[PDB]
Each structure stands twice: as structure tokens, then as C-alpha cells.
Amino acid sequence: KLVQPTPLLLSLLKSAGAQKETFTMKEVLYHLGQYIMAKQLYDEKQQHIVHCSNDPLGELFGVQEFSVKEHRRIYAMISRNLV
Ligand SMILES: CC(C)(C)C[C@@H]1N[C@@H](C(=O)NCC[C@H](O)CO)[C@H](c2cccc(Cl)c2F)[C@@]1(C#N)c1ccc(Cl)cc1F
């Protein structure tokens, strides 16, 4: 069952390379992960946290930072941004 990102979430994914309006969750995760790499939001050095205090992302997930290994939380954050 495909996900349909909200216009917000979509503009991110589109600026992250996505070329369509509906996705598999893995596809969302792939572009977002690619969005995070582009905005350099990710310190591998630190402790695998993404830092988005001042990105559209952080505003979208209603969070300042998260570990890239709190998948259960990363999924919920996304879920509230799918139509
Ligand atoms: C390049 C990058 C950002 C590390 C990809 C991430 N890297 C995935 C990840 O688990 N990284 C852990 C690497 C660690 O060194 C242990 O080997 C993220 C990920 C993959 C699948 C499922 C989830 Cl919920 C997830 F968070 C990652 C991807 N792909 C990712 C993608 C989207 C988002 Cl919103 C957060 C993320 F951390």
C-alpha cells in the first residue's frame, strides 16, 4: 500500500529528487535520507543524530533532533505527514 505525502512532506522529497506523488514507505525513507544528506543535517561523527533545529524537516517532524536509529520514532514522525 503506497503512501501519499502531504504537500509539505512532498516539496521536501521533490527537492530531494523524488519525481512523483505516491511512494512506498521505503521510497519516502530513501529520499528523506537523501534530503538529510543534502542539508548536511547528519553528524555521523557525533552519535548518529540528525540535527534539524533550523531546517524545514525539524519543523515538519516537530523535533529538534533525532537518532537515525530510533526507527520507530522516525516512522511515526513520517506517518503524520502522509495523507
Ligand atoms: C543517509 C542516512 C540519513 C544515514 C540514511 C539513514 N540511515 C538509516 C539507518 O538506519 N542508519 C543507521 C546506520 C548505523 O550506522 C547502523 O548501521 C536510516 C533508516 C533506514 C531505514 C529505516 C529507517 Cl526508519 C531509518 F531511519 C536512514 C535511511 N535510509 C534514514 C532515512 C530517513 C530518515 Cl527521516 C532518517 C534516517 F535515519
Ligand 1 pocket list (CB less than 6 A): 29, 32-33, 36-37, 42, 48, 68-69, 71, 74-75
For residue 24, give the amino acid letter: T
Measured in angstroms, the resolution is: 2.5
Spatial distance between the Cα atoms of 11 and 53, rounded to a whole number of angstroms: 19
| CATH architecture classification, 1-83 | Orthogonal Bundle (1.10)
In the chain, the largest separation of any two C-alpha atoms, in whole Å, equals 36
Distance from the alpha carbon of residue 27 to the mean position of ligand 1, in angstroms: 12
SS3 of residue 13 by DSSP? helix
Long-range contacts of 61-70 (CB under 8 A, 24+ apart): 68/42
Tell me how the structure was determined: X-ray
Probe residue for ligand 1, chosen from 68, 72, 75, 79 as the CB with the greatest number of ligand atoms within 8 Å:
68
